[PDB]
């Protein structure tokens, strides 16, 4: 069974923060939602679609029809922002299970939006005389601190050999993120160009390398 | 107060097993059950079954079939979660949690949590790191802001620090989180910003600290050749 959320919602401290979960069907199941803040362990926010366990704030309230789900945060406060679960049992044709939504990364806006800084560094020429190739990507300077990234080649999405830190905040406050494409030699110098793509709150910027050009 | 105190985590060869213990306090144990869950760094959490801790029902998911087994110890209030054949695909953080019952008409949700614990797989033994200059694009020939870094690549275990021009360089310095490659082995970036006009004129050092393997490395950042 599959459960498909928003990667990231920005809220307004004092707005409502609306965190659906759509599955098939999902209106004819109980749909339980969870609260986790960087480095703990979940907490169950509301079970069997809108109860609320005893000590959860009556500002956190939940729905369920058709085919979505809904978590509703009015007049939402600095303190909850965390990621967000949605989760469903499934009898499994005999096979009993429970899943989870992909999670939702809500902020409470607490400082000025911030688009990020794009920088994308092609290999060193040390690197490649040792038979390798790092293209970096390194992106600063954003807020809210979530962030897609995509790499291509020439044209065409590239997902085997990428790795993506989770963004965390600089010195100044604003956050940054770093991806990396790990290729070889040979793949780095066959294409016309490579670049890293940031989606950040609607919009995107592009980075471009070339092994041709001295970036 | 309902705790649920996990231990047993360690790092792993691939291969290897893991068996992670959670100790229940503060209710009846045998009347709830535990879930197991799991969460790669960075990524959302997973369900990997569920055991009856009155009975010893055990459920697990289908892409765990073989390769976890759930166990309780009654007269310590304990559950372990046993996972076999290991691979870097299972480096994550692992969480019980108490969950009431679980069955073919029910599947109650996980009210209380056990802390976490990080399984860390890798086959890597000790490793420095190498590190590669992230230099400044040929394009900074006047003035302005210039970004420079260092790529730290391929070294185990964490951590590694990084300082410029010996601690004499701290604006605009950013010193990334690790990411962790399918290899086991862990790799970072320093980047620092600095006026373009200084290009020419001052040097530029990452100074690179692993102290696990001893290592540290002074990489000279200049422009390119081109
Ligand atoms: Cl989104
Ligand atoms: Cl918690
Ligand atoms: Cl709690
Ligand atoms: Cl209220
Ligand atoms: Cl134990
Ligand atoms: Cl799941």
């Known amino acids: 069974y599959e459960l498909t959320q928003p990667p990231s919602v920005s809220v307004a401290p004092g707005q409502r923060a609306t965190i659906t979960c759509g599955g098939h069907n999902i209106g004819a199941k109980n749909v339980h939602w969870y609260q986790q803040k960087p480095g703990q362990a979940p907490v169950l926010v509301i079970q069997?679609?809108?109860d609320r366990p005893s000590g959860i704030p009556e500002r956190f309230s939940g729905s369920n029809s058709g085919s979505t789900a809904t978590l509703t945060i009015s007049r939402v406060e600095a303190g909850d922002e965390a990621d967000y679960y949605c989760?469903?049992?499934?009898?499994?044709?005999?096979?009993?299970?429970?899943?989870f939504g992909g999670g939702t990364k809500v902020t409470v806006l607490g400082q000025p939006k911030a688009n990020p800084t794009v920088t994308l560094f092609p290999p060193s020429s040390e690197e490649l005389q040792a038979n390798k190739a790092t293209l970096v990507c390194l992106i600063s300077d954003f807020y809210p601190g979530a962030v897609t990234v995509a790499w291509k080649a020439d044209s065409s999405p590239v997902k085997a050999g990428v790795e993506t830190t989770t963004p965390s905040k600089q010195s100044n406050n604003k956050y940054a993120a770093s991806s990396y494409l790990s290729l070889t030699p040979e793949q780095w110098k066959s294409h016309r160009s490579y670049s890293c793509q940031v989606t950040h709150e609607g919009s995107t910027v592009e980075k471009t390398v070339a092994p041709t050009e001295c970036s | 107060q309902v705790q649920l105190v996990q231990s047993g985590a360690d790092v792993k060869k691939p291969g290897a097993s893991v068996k992670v213990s959670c100790k229940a306090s503060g209710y009846t144990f045998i009347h709830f059950g535990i879930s197991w869950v799991r969460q790669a760094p960075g990524q959302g959490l997973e369900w990997m079954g569920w055991?009856?801790?009155?009975?010893?029902?055990?459920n697990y998911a289908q892409s765990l079939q073989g390769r976890v087994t759930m166990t309780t110890d009654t007269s310590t209030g304990t559950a372990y979660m046993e996972l076999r054949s290991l691979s870097t695909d299972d480096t994550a953080v692992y969480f019980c949690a108490r969950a009431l019952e679980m069955g073919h008409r029910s599947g109650f949700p996980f009210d209380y949590w056990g802390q976490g614990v990080l399984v860390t797989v890798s086959p890597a033994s000790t490793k420095g790191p190498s590190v590669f200059p992230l230099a400044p694009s040929s394009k900074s020939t006047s003035g302005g802001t210039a970004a420079l870094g260092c790529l730290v690549k391929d070294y185990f275990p964490e951590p590694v620090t990084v300082s410029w021009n010996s601690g004499a360089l701290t604006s605009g310095v950013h010193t990334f989180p690790a990411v962790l490659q399918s290899s086991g082995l862990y790799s970072l970036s320093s980047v620092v910003t600095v006026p373009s006009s200084s290009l020419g004129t001052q040097t530029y050092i990452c100074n690179v600290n692993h102290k696990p393997s001893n290592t540290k490395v002074d990489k000279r950042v200049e422009p390119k050749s081109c």
């Open positions: 989760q469903v049992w499934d009898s499994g044709r005999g096979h009993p299970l429970y899943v």
């Open positions: 069997y679609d809108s």
């Open positions: 055991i009856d801790t009155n009975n010893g029902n055990t």
